[PDB]
Amino acid sequence: MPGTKRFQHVIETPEPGKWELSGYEAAVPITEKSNPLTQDLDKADAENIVRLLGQCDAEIFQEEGQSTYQRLYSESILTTMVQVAGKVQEVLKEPDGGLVVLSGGGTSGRMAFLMSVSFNQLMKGLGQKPLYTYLIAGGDRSVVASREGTEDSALHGIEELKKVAAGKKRVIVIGISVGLSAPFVAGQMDCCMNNTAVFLPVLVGFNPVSMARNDPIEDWSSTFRQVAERMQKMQEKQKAFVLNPAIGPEGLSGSSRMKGGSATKILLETLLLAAHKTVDQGIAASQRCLLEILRTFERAHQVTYSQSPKIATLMKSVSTSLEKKGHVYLVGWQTLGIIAIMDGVECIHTFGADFRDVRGFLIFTFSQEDFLTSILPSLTEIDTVVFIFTLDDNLTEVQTIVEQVKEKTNHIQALAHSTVGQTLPIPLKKLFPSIISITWPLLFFEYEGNFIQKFQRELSTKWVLNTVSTGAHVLLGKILQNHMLDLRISNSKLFWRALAMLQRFSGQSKARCIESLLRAIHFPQPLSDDIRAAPISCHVQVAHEKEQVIPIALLSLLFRCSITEAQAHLAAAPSVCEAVRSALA
Numbered sequence: 006m007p008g009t010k011r012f013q014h015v016i017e018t019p020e021p022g023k024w025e026l027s028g029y030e031a032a033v034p035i036t037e038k039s040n041p042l043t044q045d046l047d048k049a050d051a052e053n054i055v056r057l058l059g060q061c062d063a064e065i066f067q068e069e070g071q072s073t074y075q076r077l078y079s080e081s082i083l084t085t086m087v088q089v090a091g092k093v094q095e096v097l098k099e100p101d102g103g104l105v106v107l108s109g110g111g112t113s114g115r116m117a118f119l120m121s122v123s124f125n126q127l128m129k130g131l132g133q134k135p136l137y138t139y140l141i142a143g144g145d146r147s148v149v150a151s152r153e154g155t156e157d158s159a160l161h162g163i164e165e166l167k168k169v170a171a172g173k174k175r176v177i178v179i180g181i182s183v184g185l186s187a188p189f190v191a192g193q194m195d196c197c198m199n200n201t202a203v204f205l206p207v208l209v210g211f212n213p214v215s216m217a218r219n220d221p222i223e224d225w226s227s228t229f230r231q232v233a234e235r236m237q238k239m240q241e242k243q244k245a246f247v248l249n250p251a252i253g254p255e256g257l258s259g260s261s262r263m264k265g266g267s268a269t270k271i272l273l274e275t276l277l278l279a280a281h282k283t284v285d286q287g288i289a290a291s292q293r294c295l296l297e298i299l300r301t302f303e304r305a306h307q308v309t310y311s312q313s314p315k316i317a318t319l320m321k322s323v324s325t326s327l328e329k330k331g332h333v334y335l336v337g338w339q340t341l342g343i344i345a346i347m348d349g350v351e352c353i354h355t356f357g358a359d360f361r362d363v364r365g366f367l368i369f370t371f372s373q374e375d376f377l378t379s380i381l382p383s384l385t386e387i388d389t390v391v392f393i394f395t396l397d398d399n400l401t402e403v404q405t406i407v408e409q410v411k412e413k414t415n416h417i418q419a420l421a422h423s424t425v426g427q428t429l430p431i432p433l434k435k436l437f438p439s440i441i442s443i444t445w446p447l448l449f450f451e452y453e454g455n456f457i458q459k460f461q462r463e464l465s466t467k468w469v470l471n472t473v474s475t476g477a478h479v480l481l482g483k484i485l486q487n488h489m490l491d492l493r494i495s496n497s498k499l500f501w502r503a504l505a506m507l508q509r510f511s512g513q514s515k516a517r518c519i520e521s522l523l524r525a526i527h528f529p530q531p532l533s534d535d536i537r538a539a540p541i542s543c544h545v546q547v548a549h550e551k552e553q554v555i556p557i558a559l560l561s562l563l564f565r566c567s568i569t570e571a572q573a574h575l576a577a578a579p580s581v582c583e584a585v586r587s588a589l590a
């Protein structure tokens with residue numbers, strides 16, 4: 006038929022009660038599953054949400070049981086991290102004609118950037134020439150922008166890589182895709198494998214290779230699964246590597262900004278920090294060095310979620326601030342300001358939130374006597390400002406701003422990263438009665454700016470901000486069980502997530518769900534044969550511009566009615582979410 010081939014890889018909708026036994030669930034990639042821990046997340050109160058997402062993040066560190074998917078601590082994973090640390094070494098010995106690229110779209114690309122700076126600092130600090138760089142879907146503007154459409158081109162990924170790979174002679178390309186999903190990455194990896202004598206591809210994600218994407222990429226002939234299958238074969242001869250531990254599903258299904266983002270830093274900082282630290286020692290990096298690092302990162306989680314109660318509250322002040330239709334501000338210094346920006350940008354696509362609903366500031370990059378003049382005026386009784394900084398920062402730069410924001414705002418609150426027994430100047434910092442002090446042990450540090458202390462803090466902030474931003478919106482009633490139904494379809498992956506969600510909630514056939522989705526997307530145009538057979542980017546591009554696409558499609562299905570009828574029905578309910586919930590009853 007027309008469209009049959011575009012949709013060929015979609016498994017049919019199981020008959021009720023047979024979701025398990027048709028083998029459908031076993032086909033859903035780990036990264037997209039519903040985490041059972043979060044089945045009733047739309048009901049958790051602020052303190053549970055914090056617990057539940059604390060539990061989900063912990064799974065990053067959970068070990069392998071006895072037939073089952075390998076994990077962060079399995080010896081096949083750590084061995085591979087050893088081998089890779091190793092290849093990063095060769096390059097560090099030959100900094101002339103040498104380069105190391107970290108690449109991904111979306112948050113994988115953000116993570117890539119963060120880590121390229123750090124590992125560039127570290128080499129600067131020893132007056133070694135910088136070898137790291139990053140690549141993000143849609144260039145550097147993407148690092149601080151919501152730009153979900155940019156990941157779909159394999160040729161774009163190959164372009165951006167051909168740029169930075171110059172006339173260099175040894176290139177390590179660490180391609181990052183939580184889902185083993187992004188076409189951007191796929192093309193980089195396939196390119197690398199064509200020119201081994203220069204390129205070393207290393208692929209980082211969190212699905213087994215047999216769950217890697219196998220739907221066709223519009224500008225490329227092989228799929229992600231093929232590329233990854235072939236990289237795995239090459240690993241036997243140490244010419245490619247696949248680093249792909251399971252870490253369990255995301256608390257909000259498919260939200261790979263969360264665990265996926267964290268596991269990415271954890272996995273790669275670990276392995277890179279080891280690479281360097283063991284070079285000047287003139288010793289092979291070993292599982293033992295990595296493990297120290299990993300266990301530090303696993304302490305970091307326990308440390309970080311010690312502050313759960315105060316985390317829950319900061320979430321409550323954010324929820325109400327956004328219920329009351331206010332705005333929310335995150336202000337922070339050095340890399341923690343960045344991480345702030347990042348969390349706020351992600352709320353746009355992740356929740357259909359406006360770019361002011363939760364905004365991030367660095368000292369986006371709006372300075373002391375700047376933020377005070379421009380942003381400060383328009384704050385309000387109902388708003389919330391959040392301060393994120395270490396005590397090794399300019400605390401006089403800090404207090405000024407809090408002195409000032411105590412004017413319009415009262416719901417402030419802060420996130421203070423001390424190394425133990427640093428005190429916190431002004432005991433009149435009962436500006437924040439119950440701050441979020443997170444205090445870090447003393448450690449042994451050789452390298453420059455105590456990089457492990459950076460990674461810990463960064464990671465803990467990400468955990469905090471993410472849990473908080475995600476937490477706020479669930480509380481608002483905006484999530485359905487642990488799914489975001491009402492997403493904006495802005496790339497092919499989200500198109501598939503939409504379709505899958507229509508099948509899950511309607512229980513109706515694949516062909517009906519596809520029909521309702523394409524009708525909803527293209528309304529008022531009807532299903533022509535061209536539209537049915539069009540490449541998925543055609544639907545993406547049109548859907549990207551609409552509102553309530555997925556709920557209208559689900560409604561069409563549940564009432565077994567038309568798009569005109571479901572739109573009118575929706576317009577008649579108090580809100581999207583009641584329309585949907587009601588219709589499920």
Ligand SMILES: O=S(=O)(c1cccs1)N1CCN(c2ccc(C(O)(C(F)(F)F)C(F)(F)F)cc2)CC1
Binds near residue numbers: 039186488502506
């Ligand atoms: O090819 S994909 O783009 C892909 C991306 C990454 C690796 S492969 N596509 C695979 C299937 N997929 C999905 C999503 C949700 C469900 C759900 O059934 C429900 F729709 F309900 F969300 C579940 F989460 F509940 F399990 C099922 C399947 C989304 C993405």
Ligand SMILES: O=P(O)(O)OC[C@@H](O)[C@@H](O)[C@H](O)[C@@H](O)CO
Binds near residue numbers: 354
């Ligand atoms: O790392 P992947 O699977 O290639 O995902 C790449 C991006 O889609 C992903 O980071 C996305 O932008 C975030 O919205 C996830 O909440």
